[PDB]
């Protein structure tokens, strides 16, 4: 089987993106954030803290002839950015796209940080990443991807981003009419229990193509391009009136500069990413500073190749035995 479902940007700077899902019998549709670099598929729910809730969908377990309690289970995430939930756990039949999962992990909400309350457009996270990452105790859970993997036609899931406007997130099959020329595949380390490889080097804008190893996670779930200090600055150095700001704590550059592409490697091809994808827009109403969307991993303490730079191509998460990532041009 395979399953197909539009993604659509939740703003107009491509903040995050929210893909419905289907969850419980009958089912209760609720638009998730579908997230590679973590585990755990997590919602608001009927037993979220209702000041904690804030227009929000909300997943009510009573409702579903399908769900069942999962006795004794709890989870706790904590995300890179601060933002934090946990709750209790539930199993129920989860569907994507025509994909349907039965006794899929749902991990109910008793409480979230203020990040996801002020965030109305979101419902919950579906984590894409390996499920050693789960955190769901003292048993842990699959993904919705590693449940569905025996019945997908290939143990494969696409990203298909788009820049200002929808896209798609495809399970079990390859479409080969979303990009032009090859896939290039590159392979992927699961040892910290994320998407992690390797890319062959940079270039900005129309400049020479240094090649150089820079290791780090394809992630859905982060907006922006976190990449070495060395890297960065690079980019920045060429942005005239571009400065790292502690007051606003990033890379900003006055609003009327035009940003130069990048280009990230992927063994031999070349991803390029427009000028424009950079542009995340003013630091606050009215003003003339706009923010990066290139800053420096050196606080985070691992480099992250965030929507900015997956949205520039085709992405295939490639879950078999031997895990790979392809990247083609679009
Ligand atoms: N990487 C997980 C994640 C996803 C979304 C959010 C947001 F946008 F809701 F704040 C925070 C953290």
């Given at each position: ?202 270039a900005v804008g129309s400049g020479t193509f240094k ?27 060429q ?21 130069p ?70």
């Amino acid at each position: 089987s395979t399953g197909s479902a539009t993604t659509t940007p939740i703003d107009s700077l491509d903040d995050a993106y929210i893909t419905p899902v289907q969850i419980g019998t009958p089912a209760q549709t609720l638009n998730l954030d579908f997230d590679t670099g973590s585990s755990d598929l997590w919602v608001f729910s009927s037993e979220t803290t209702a000041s904690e809730v804030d227009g929000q969908t909300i997943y009510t377990p009573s409702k579903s002839t399908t769900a069942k309690l999962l006795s004794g289970a709890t989870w706790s995430i904590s995300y890179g950015d601060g933002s934090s939930s946990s709750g209790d756990v539930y199993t129920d039949t989860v569907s994507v796209g025509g994909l349907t999962v039965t006794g899929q992990a749902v991990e109910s909400a008793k409480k979230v940080s203020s990040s996801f309350t002020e965030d109305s457009t979101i419902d919950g996270l579906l984590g894409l990443a390996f499920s050693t990452l789960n955190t769901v105790s003292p048993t842990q859970q699959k993904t919705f991807f590693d449940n569905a993997k025996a019945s997908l036609d290939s143990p494969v899931f696409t990203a298909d981003l788009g820049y200002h406007a929808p896209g798609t997130y495809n399970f079990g099959f390859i479409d080969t009419t979303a990009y032009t020329g090859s896939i290039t595949y590159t392979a992927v380390s699961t040892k910290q229990g994320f998407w992690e490889w390797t890319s062959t080097g940079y270039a900005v804008g129309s400049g020479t193509f240094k090649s150089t190893s820079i290791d780090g996670i394809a992630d859905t779930g982060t907006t922006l391009l976190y990449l070495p200090a060395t890297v960065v600055s690079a980019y920045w150095a060429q942005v005239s009136g571009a400065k790292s700001s502690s007051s606003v704590g990033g890379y900003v550059f006055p609003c009327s500069a035009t940003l130069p592409s990048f280009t990230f490697g992927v063994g031999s091809a070349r991803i390029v990413i427009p000028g424009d994808y950079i542009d995340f827009g003013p630091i606050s109403t009215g003003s003339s500073s706009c923010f990066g969307g290139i800053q420096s991993s050196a606080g985070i303490g691992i480099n992250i190749f965030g929507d900015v730079a997956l949205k520039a191509a085709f992405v295939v998460f490639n879950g078999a035995t031997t895990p790979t990532l392809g990247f083609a041009s679009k």
